[PDB]
Design a protein around this ligand. Structure first.
Ligand code: HEM
Ligand code: HEM
Ligand code: HNI
Ligand code: HNI
Lengths: 141, 146, 146, 141
């Protein structure tokens, strides 16, 4: 996929995430709706407000999706297909929203895991999302 | 500038508790590790082959110190960002030729830097405040391109 | 971000040969094909499921007519693109929610279309020029943000 | 990225390029340098005045390269290894420029190949050079 040093750290970043992963994912989502309102017109059917459980389960979905995307790293396009097909095709999502969510994810990870937020994991983590971002983007049509 | 006062008060607020001696080197240093190409503008500075390398450096930190000032300066002047960064908009564009896209990246690294320093205190709404800000600055810093 | 005579004359000249009933369609149609996601602001155009379906969409082909009219007229007001696109900026921004990035994209697509129709006549100096227009125009069209 | 069809299309477009890739690649450079000048610095020791020498030669440089990558579609990170190191560590080329040259390269194909440059090839082609650009700037350290 990318630098074993990159998989080293990315493995170790979600190594302290654990059971929180569901919650971290939803914060990112929440962070993404508040700082970039436009992203809200992709979920015009959710209570996009605070505490909504919809965001909660949803964040879990994205987090697992990611954990899952961490596992099948060297073949993400493969293990993320049903998604490539869902955001690219079903929902048509502008990639600028992927860069936005990825950024909100680093902020959440930064706010909760200071000791693990080393510039090196920051670079490693950010690339991983650049990629995951692409796969859910390397199939539109 | 278009920030509710609630956000305006929230910003300066958090802003005050910032270690103006460390945050900028933190930001600019991170900019280089995360987005390497950006190093092509700081060859004058030295060892930047490894993270600790890049991070340790006193120039990188010395500089971020100058950068942050420009930010503080910006925060203190949300209704006049365009004016506040004028010569910078020229320095970075006309003279240096920095692609304006790196203004936004630094802006978001700064946000990660703050988040890292205030943990849970850097709340989703506060972040929202700052994004309007860092966008406001990257955007006026690239004006001499417009 | 400013236009000289040599240019002004070159850009006007070549546009004189632009069939305002075929370029938009091509430009807009290519946007939808090249950058799929742009298809989201056009789901009420029925089908755009394949390159052909999109390229032969009286809706698609229609809209690009007015999109290029938009250009053609804004090309008359090179000194106040900010005025000329004022009302469209609010629309795509506050109303449509089109990320300003797709504005840089629609312009490079256009430039690609001018080269595909005028081949060798769309010479580098010719492109250098048209590039500044699409640049100001995309910029002008992203004004109600910043 | 670039679905199978895209693989198919890229080759269609290539086919008709043949040995032409020397003027074409050179014309992209030529064009890029003119339309976006900042880009001039990566070449401060280059004479890039219309028709120029170094420009034409370097033109072959970039061309041969894309044939290697196209004929090597599935093997892109490795098949293109030599380059990454050069453009990332040594050159540290701001990724925006791979967006600038890629565009010009495209202007050129469409100016010399009116029948090949269709909306399907286009998309497939841009995705190509995007995928080549990613693998050209991912290695940075
Ligand atoms: C929008 C956020 C940014 C702000 C507020 C900012 C601000 C500044 C300021 C205040 C200076 C002081 C120059 C002087 O008078 O000595 C400076 C210098 C400089 N900046 Fe930035 N900058 C930003 C983004 C960037 C980016 C993204 C780059 C590219 C990686 C960059 C590259 C440079 C360089 C190369 C210098 C000159 C260093 C030298 O003296 O040799 N800046 N900047
Ligand atoms: C389609 C994307 C590109 C490809 C396939 C490509 C390919 C190549 C190749 C094969 C070489 C020469 C390797 C050697 O024999 O030493 C080269 C050199 C070079 N490239 Fe690119 N390139 C691309 C984009 C760019 C961009 C966007 C820039 C910056 C604006 C750039 C700047 C340079 C420079 C400065 C050299 C070294 C010239 C010299 O001093 O010998 N390239 N490139
Ligand atoms: C704002 C745009 C947007 C972005 C940038 C984005 C980015 C991402 C990323 C980035 C790495 C990941 C891993 C991801 C993962 C997922 N998304 Ni995303 N999604 C987005 C908008 C959606 C929407 C909309 C849904 C379905 C909402 C609904 O109606 O239930 C969704 C649903 C999902 C699901 C649930 C699928 C299912 O129903 O089984 C997963 C998993 N996603 N999304
Ligand atoms: C893919 C996103 C997108 C882009 C990049 C884009 C880029 C551009 C550009 C070049 C930067 C120009 C000059 C332009 C001009 C126009 N657009 Ni765009 N438009 C886009 C999506 C739309 C949509 C959607 C409409 C229908 C608007 C409405 O509410 O009627 C539209 C409508 C218009 C209209 C007609 C408005 C009306 O009838 O009141 C003009 C003129 N435009 N658009």
């Amino acid at each position: 996929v990318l630098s074993p040093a990159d998989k080293t750290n990315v493995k170790a970043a979600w190594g302290k995430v654990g059971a929180h992963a569901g919650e971290y994912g939803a914060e990112a989502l929440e962070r993404m709706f508040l700082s970039f309102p436009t992203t809200k017109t992709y979920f015009p059917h959710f209570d996009l407000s605070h505490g909504s459980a919809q965001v909660k389960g949803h964040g879990k979905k994205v987090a697992d999706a990611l954990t899952n995307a961490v596992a099948h790293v060297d073949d993400m396009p493969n293990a993320l297909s049903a998604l490539s097909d869902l955001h690219a095709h079903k929902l048509r999502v502008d990639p600028v929203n992927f860069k936005l969510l990825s950024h909100c994810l680093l902020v959440t990870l930064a706010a909760h895991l200071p000791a693990e937020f080393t510039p090196a994991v920051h670079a490693s983590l950010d690339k991983f999302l650049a990629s995951v971002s692409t796969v859910l983007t390397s199939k539109y049509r | 500038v278009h920030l509710t006062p609630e956000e305006k008060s929230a910003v300066t607020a958090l802003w005050g508790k910032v270690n103006v001696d460390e945050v900028g080197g933190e930001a600019l240093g991170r900019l280089l590790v995360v987005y390497p190409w950006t190093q092509r503008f700081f060859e004058s500075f030295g060892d930047l082959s490894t993270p600790d390398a890049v991070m340790g450096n006193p120039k990188v930190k010395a500089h971020g110190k100058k950068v942050l000032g420009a930010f503080s300066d910006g925060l203190a002047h949300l209704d006049n960002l365009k004016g506040t960064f004028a010569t910078l908009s020229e320095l970075h564009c006309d003279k240096l030729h920095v692609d304006p896209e790196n203004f936004r990246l630094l802006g978001n690294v700064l946000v990660c830097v703050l988040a890292h320093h205030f943990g849970k205190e850097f709340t989703p709404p506060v972040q929202a405040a700052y994004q309007k800000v860092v966008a406001g600055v990257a955007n006026a810093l690239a004006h001499k391109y417009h």
